[PDB]
Amino acid sequence: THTALDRYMELADRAVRDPSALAELPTIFAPDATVTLRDEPVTGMPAIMEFYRVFVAAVAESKHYWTTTILEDGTIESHWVVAARRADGSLMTAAGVEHATVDTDGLITNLRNRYTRTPG
Amino acid sequence: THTALDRYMELADRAVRDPSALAELPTIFAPDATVTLRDEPVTGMPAIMEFYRVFVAAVAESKHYWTTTILEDGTIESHWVVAARRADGSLMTAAGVEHATVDTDGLITNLRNRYTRTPG
Numbered sequence A, B: 001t002h003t004a005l006d007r008y009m010e011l012a013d014r015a016v017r018d019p020s021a022l023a024e025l026p027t028i029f030a031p032d033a034t035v036t037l038r039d040e041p042v043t044g045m046p047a048i049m050e051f052y053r054v055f056v057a058a059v060a061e062s063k064h065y066w067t068t069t070i071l072e073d074g075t076i077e078s079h080w081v082v083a084a085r086r087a088d089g090s091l092m093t094a095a096g097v098e099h100a101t102v103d104t105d106g107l108i109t110n111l112r113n114r115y116t117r118t119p120g
Helices: A004-017 A019-027 A044-056 B003-017 B021-025 B045-057
Strands: A029-036 A042-043 A059-070 A077-087 A091-102 A108-117 B029-036 B058-072 B076-084 B093-101 B109-118
Touching: A004 A019, A004 A059, A004 A077, A004 A091, A004 A108, A004 B045, A019 A029, A019 A044, A029 A044, A029 B029, A029 B045, A042 A044, A044 A059, A059 B058, A059 B076, A077 B058, A091 B045, A091 B058, A091 B076, A091 B093, B003 B021, B003 B045, B003 B058, B003 B093, B003 B109, B021 B029, B021 B045, B029 B045, B045 B058
Parallel strands: A029 A108, B029 B109
Antiparallel strands: A029 A042, A059 A077, A077 A091, A077 B076, A091 A108, B058 B076, B076 B093, B093 B109
């Protein structure tokens, strides 16, 4: 599928290679969206773009796989996994579930992640 | 680096995309090699090729990252991570350390893996 959460997942790996791809964020998230990947929310396009710039700076190479469903209530859910080499040379994996609220255009207003395998 | 264990790691993902690439196995392992990925050993090129055919058959897409060192005694060690979509559609990650003995040609005579993050 090709929901905004799918585009979000595709962008994660592309932005690692090419950080300037993060200019696509306003085609994925609404203005004034709020994102919480772990513990802290980040709200609005300027904060979101900087959070992801700093996120992708810390990664040398990554690959994500994911499966996406649209729930009962219109919420989108993507189970995902990643493997990566971090910019410090360490290797990592993680897995979790992302839950997005979308608006009428289909752009993400609220993104929250829960880890099922913490980054490690 | 480009040791035999590096070539093994590279083949892991390529063979998922193109199983015919497992014909490269005799450029990586000596004949009569023994491999133990988890619990039970598999010995000799014919058993090794079949083990890996069955292995890659169970995987739809994967990516590995790894770092390789040559140890004091000349055994090779690669820390590695993987994320994958299995052939049953499930997602997984895993991580571990592979230790290879090599012969004077540099081909692997004995490969053993220990998981630091079990497949799941």
